[PDB]
């Protein structure tokens, strides 16, 4: 996150850090708890990941330094990638992680509500992007979870900013015309959480952008409302 501030412990209790174990353990992407065995994240995070066996999900983390060999995590039973996904820039950048064990909900780890079909018409004015990613284009994974409030942008305005790309309605963009506050490397897969009627909703998944926090380069997010039926299809299978 560029131009953000340190989060307070328990501020984004749905935020998880997804680690890979191969070849050595490191943070890979962000993700969000959406169900007691479900993490919603970005499909591009699993490029080259040949097995769910190398993955570890950590919930209830403020600082990456809380993670040691003795830190408890959730194993991944299954990686579910949208079958239309080709690349982040073309969309369908959505994946579900089925956890091997159930998340026990509490003040440190709990789910974020998915948007409602009726919330397709609502205007969100209090949206935040979070993560342990870079503060600048060439940087390193941050110890403390950062947050940055970002304004949503119309599809029309976002399409003007990305000549040569096709910004679909299954994408949602957010950013300041002057840049300065944005997601950056290592934040991808994480949430764009928007508060509405005192309830937080998972509006987007950090997907792609041209560099980080550049002027007239909104961040492009998977528009979660357009995948609610897909999420229920995969999480509520009979």
Ligand X SMILES: COC(=O)Nc1ccc2c(c1)NC(=O)[C@H](C)CCC[C@H](NC(=O)c1cnn(-c3cccc(Cl)c3F)c1N)c1cc-2ccn1
Cite the active site residues. 44, 93, 188
29/194 with CB nearer ligand X: 29
138/163 with CB nearer ligand X: 138
Estimate the share of the chain in helix, then strand, then coil, as percent rounded to the nearest 5. Answer: 15, 35, 50
- Least distance to ligand X from the beta carbon of 102, Å? 26
Q: In the chain, count H helices and then E strands.
A: 2, 14
163 labelled ligand-binding? yes
What distance in Å separates the CA atoms of residue 23 and residue 44, rounded to the nearest whole number? 19
Residue ranges binding ligand X (CB under 6 A): 26-29, 44-45, 47, 133, 141, 182-188, 206-209, 212, 219-221
37/207 with CB nearer ligand X: 207
Residue 30 sits at the vertex; the CA angle it makes with 145 and 102, to the nearest 5 degrees, is 105
CB 6 within 8 Å of CB 145: yes
- Least distance to ligand X from the beta carbon of 120, Å? 20
Longest CA–CA separation in the chain, Å = 49
161 labelled ligand-binding? yes
136 labelled ligand-binding? no
Which positions make up the binding site for heparin?
160-163
Which positions make up the binding site?
160-163
């Amino acid at each position: 996150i560029v131009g953000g501030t340190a989060s307070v412990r328990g501020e984004w209790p749905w935020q998880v850090t997804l680690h890979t174990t191969s070849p050595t353990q490191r943070h890979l992407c962000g993700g969000s708890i959406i169900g007691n065995q479900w993490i919603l994240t970005a499909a591009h995070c699993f490029y080259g990941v040949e097995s769910p066996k190398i993955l570890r999900v950590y919930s209830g983390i403020l600082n990456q330094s809380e993670i040691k060999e003795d830190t408890s995590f959730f194993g991944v039973q299954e990686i579910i990638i949208h079958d239309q996904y080709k690349m982040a820039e073309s969309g369908y950048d959505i994946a579900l992680l089925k956890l091997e064990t159930t998340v026990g909900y509490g003040d440190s780890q709990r789910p974020i509500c998915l948007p409602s079909k009726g919330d397709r018409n609502v205007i969100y004015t209090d949206c935040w992007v979070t993560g342990w990613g870079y503060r600048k284009l060439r940087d390193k994974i941050q110890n403390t979870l950062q947050k940055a409030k970002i304004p949503l942008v119309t599809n029309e305005e976002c399409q003007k900013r990305y000549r040569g790309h096709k910004i679909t309605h299954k994408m949602i963009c957010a950013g300041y015309r002057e840049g300065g506050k944005d997601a950056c490397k290592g934040d991808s897969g994480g949430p764009l959480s928007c508060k509405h009627n005192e309830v937080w909703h998972l509006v987007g998944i950090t997907s792609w952008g041209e560099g980080c926090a550049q002027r007239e380069r909104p961040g492009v997010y998977t528009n979660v409302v357009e995948y609610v039926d897909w999420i229920l299809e995969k999480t509520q299978a009979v």
